[PDB]
Amino acid sequence: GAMNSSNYAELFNNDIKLFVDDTNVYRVTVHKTFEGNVATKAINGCIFTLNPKTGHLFLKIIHTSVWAGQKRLSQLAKWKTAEEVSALVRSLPKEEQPKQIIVTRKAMLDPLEVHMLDFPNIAIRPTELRLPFSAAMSIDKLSDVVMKATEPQMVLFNIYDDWLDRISSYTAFSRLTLLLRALKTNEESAKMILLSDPTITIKSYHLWPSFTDEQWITIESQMRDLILTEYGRKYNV
Amino acid sequence: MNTVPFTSAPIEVTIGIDQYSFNVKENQPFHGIKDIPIGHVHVIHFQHADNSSMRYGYWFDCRMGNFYIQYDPKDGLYKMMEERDGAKFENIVHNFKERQMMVSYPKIDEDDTWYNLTEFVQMDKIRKIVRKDENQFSYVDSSMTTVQENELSDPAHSLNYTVINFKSREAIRPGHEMEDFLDKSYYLNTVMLQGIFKNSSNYFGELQFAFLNAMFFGNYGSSLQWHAMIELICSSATVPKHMLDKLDEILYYQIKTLPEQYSDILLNERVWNICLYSSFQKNSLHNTEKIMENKYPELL
Ligand SMILES: CCN(CC)C(=O)c1ccc(B(O)O)cc1
Numbered sequence A: 001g002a003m004n005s006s007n008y009a010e011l012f013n014n015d016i017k018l019f020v021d022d023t024n025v026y027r028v029t030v031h032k033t034f035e036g037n038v039a040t041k042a043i044n045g046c047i048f049t050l051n052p053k054t055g056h057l058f059l060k061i062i063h064t065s066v067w068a069g070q071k072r073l074s075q076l077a078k079w080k081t082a083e084e085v086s087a088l089v090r091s092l093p094k095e096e097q098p099k100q101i102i103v104t105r106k107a108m109l110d111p112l113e114v115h116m117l118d119f120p121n122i123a124i125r126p127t128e129l130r131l132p133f134s135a136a137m138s139i140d141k142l143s144d145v146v147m148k149a150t151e152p153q154m155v156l157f158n159i160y161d162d163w164l165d166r167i168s169s170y171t172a173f174s175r176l177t178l179l180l181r182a183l184k185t186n187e188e189s190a191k192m193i194l195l196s197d198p199t200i201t202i203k204s205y206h207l208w209p210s211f212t213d214e215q216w217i218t219i220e221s222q223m224r225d226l227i228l229t230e231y232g233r234k235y236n237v
Numbered sequence B: 001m002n003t004v005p006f007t008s009a010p011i012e013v014t015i016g017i018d019q020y021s022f023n024v025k026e027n028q029p030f031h032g033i034k035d036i037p038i039g040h041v042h043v044i045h046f047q048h049a050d051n052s053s054m055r056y057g058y059w060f061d062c063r064m065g066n067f068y069i070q071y072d073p074k075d076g077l078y079k080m081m082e083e084r085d086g087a088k089f090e091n092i093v094h095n096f097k098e099r100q101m102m103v104s105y106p107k108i109d110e111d112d113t114w115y116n117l118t119e120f121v122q123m124d125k126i127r128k129i130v131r132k133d134e135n136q137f138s139y140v141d142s143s144m145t146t147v148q149e150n151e152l153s154d155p156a157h158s159l160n161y162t163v164i165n166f167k168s169r170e171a172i173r174p175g176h177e178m179e180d181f182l183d184k185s186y187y188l189n190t191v192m193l194q195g196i197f198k199n200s201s202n203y204f205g206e207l208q209f210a211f212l213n214a215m216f217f218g219n220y221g222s223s224l225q226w227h228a229m230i231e232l233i234c235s236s237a238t239v240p241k242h243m244l245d246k247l248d249e250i251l252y253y254q255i256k257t258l259p260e261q262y263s264d265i266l267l268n269e270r271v272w273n274i275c276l277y278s279s280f281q282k283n284s285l286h287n288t289e290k291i292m293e294n295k296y297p298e299l300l
Helices: A008-012 A073-091 A106-115 A133-138 A140-148 A169-185 A187-195 A213-235 B086-098 B113-118 B123-129 B147-151 B177-182 B185-197 B200-217 B220-234 B241-257 B260-266 B269-278 B286-295
Strands: A017-021 A027-032 A038-043 A045-050 A056-062 A100-103 A123-125 A153-158 B002-005 B013-017 B020-024 B032-036 B042-048 B051-060 B066-072 B077-083 B138-141
Touching: A008 A169, A017 A073, A017 A133, A045 A073, A045 A133, A045 A140, A056 A073, A056 A140, A073 A106, A073 B177, A100 A106, A106 A123, A106 B177, A133 A140, A133 A169, A133 A187, A140 A153, A169 A187, A169 A213, A187 A213, B002 B066, B002 B086, B013 B032, B032 B086, B042 B077, B042 B200, B051 B077, B051 B123, B051 B200, B066 B086, B077 B086, B113 B200, B113 B241, B123 B138, B123 B200, B138 B200, B147 B220, B177 B185, B185 B200, B185 B220, B200 B220, B200 B241, B200 B260, B220 B241, B220 B269, B241 B286, B269 B286
Parallel strands: A017 A100, A100 A123
Antiparallel strands: A017 A045, A027 A038, A045 A056, A056 A153, B002 B032, B013 B020, B013 B042, B042 B051, B051 B138, B066 B077
């Protein structure tokens, strides 16, 4: 059924699965027209597809040309997401097809179910977890590839870099979600924390700096402090 | 006018004939129903006084044979049988009539209700939904499941309604997923009407039969089918103008006939609010919307 805190370790078993987040597929800036009305201008977006066990991020880049002459774009964006996820499953061999796809927003259930009718054995599930994947566009190299794209494209990032060599995927996912929650809550401060020290330098192939085990403990603590700080600022606590 | 004689009435029972009903007391001198209008299918149905479990009954057309009812004390129910000896049958009926042992089908001359509820229902099509080929009449009861329900248990005893499933490969063309899911016109017009039913009359006949089995037997799967067939039309942007006007009339008479006190179990709030207020046809069912808003405004 749905995915929540009780069956949480299922995310890290050996049944291949992906998280699909559509919150950055259809992105707009709102502005005033010369006549004083309001209009939107689309900008490039992306589909965030993550294998939580391996850390691979299969980012589809959604180029603004896909919206040209279309209506009801917020609704279309859900069906375009489902179409692209189905097409990635279709491309893969039988032994790489995911046994489950977990959508971060319930509005994706029917579009994905309908596009995946050919795959009755793949479970399409919602989640009770509030995951901060919308902040993926705060990771500089992901935002750069999306905004520079001149055409549709799907680009591989490794959101756990080489962490799996040293930690389990349960721990890696916890670290990712803490980093993304912090970037969502106060992006400037989170990036300040991540980059303050110019000597542990985020390597050319990396998103996340090459922190030692001890430095990650310190970073993770500083991110918790940022989240707690912002919570206090928000609610006057 | 035709007759369905009863051998006897050994157990106390509420007997329905189409939209009418009456009580028969244990061993009361009751020998059946006369003056049944020729030209329509009919249903004669039963609910035992001592065990309201199992409503059951029989769909029949008096033009297709001479039918009577006889209680079976072994299987414990009133059974429909056909009499092949026509002279015997006429002779029995005439005696019961002369002794005034029969209730009269109480049709008011002004009243077209039964016609309006069965306009498209034909005995030949009932016998394809209800499979028992050795009889000319069809038994239905409150517990019989539909073929679709059995996909989700005896098949000889199923209601073989046409399966409707909005998230099925039959409903959705590869490459037209959003289009076909948000606008059911393909499923309705090409798959169902051209492909399976052939015409809108056969579609409406199954819809009307499903409603009547839901109402008269409390058959849950029939209620599901009735709502599915309504939603399929209302959720299609492209429906022939004559189908919409006829659907409005069909539904009007169904809502008009429904017992007010069964409204809570026979009407799906989601389906009706979607159909009347959100669907493509939200403005095409004026008569139905008017009776629904005046009779069942709670549901909405
Ligand atoms: C569903 C997309 N794919 C295929 C690219 C995966 O999720 C995947 C499957 C298996 C491995 B593995 O080496 O165990 C890594 C990644």
